[PDB]
């Protein structure tokens, strides 16, 4: 999984997944395809009290809820704003769920470890634990978004104020 030391063997890898991709602000970023709950808006984003301000807030998924994260927030995006962040991204991990707010989806596509090899690694707010990586499609780039360990890696921090015991 990326973070740190990607330096990719290319020995073992996947080498060869496929990818939503979405965009946000002026940037690109995809996300393993199969992770992906399901696509959504913005329009109920619930803003806990005393949440950490990485959850921007829990939303209203086609049936239930999830806790959404902020990229502005987790990563130190350029503008987002109730025009360019209004889209939703739901994602699901081994027995969790979360997403994302964004401008919109792009694409879907598919990258090889070969190109997922950098990380925007940048003095963002985004911590190497959970951060995620770069590659390139052609022409285009996409920041390959860290998934199976994000809410792996946030869960201690994330529940502490937002198990919903908490709220």
Not at 63 to 80: A, M, N
Not at 127 to 151: C, P, Q
Not at 155 to 163: C, I, P
């Amino acid at each position: 999984m990326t973070g740190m030391t990607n330096v990719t063997k290319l020995a073992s890898e996947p080498s060869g997944q496929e990818f939503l991709v979405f965009t946000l602000g002026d940037e690109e970023y995809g996300i393993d395809i199969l992770k992906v709950q399901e696509i959504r808006g913005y329009d109920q984003v619930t803003r806990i009290a005393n949440t950490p301000a990485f959850i921007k807030g829990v939303t209203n998924l086609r049936g239930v809820i999830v806790p959404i994260v902020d990229l502005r927030i987790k990563f130190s995006q350029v503008d987002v704003d109730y025009n360019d962040n209004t889209v939703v991204i739901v994602l699901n991990l081994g027995q969790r769920v979360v997403g994302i707010v964004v401008d919109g989806v792009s694409d879907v596509l598919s990258l090889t470890a070969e190109q997922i090899r950098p990380a925007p690694e940048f003095a963002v707010t985004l911590s190497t634990e959970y951060l995620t990586g770069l590659g390139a499609l052609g022409d285009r780039m996409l920041i390959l978004v860290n998934i199976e360990k994000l809410l792996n890696s946030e869960e201690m921090a994330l529940l502490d104020s937002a198990a919903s015991e908490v709220a």
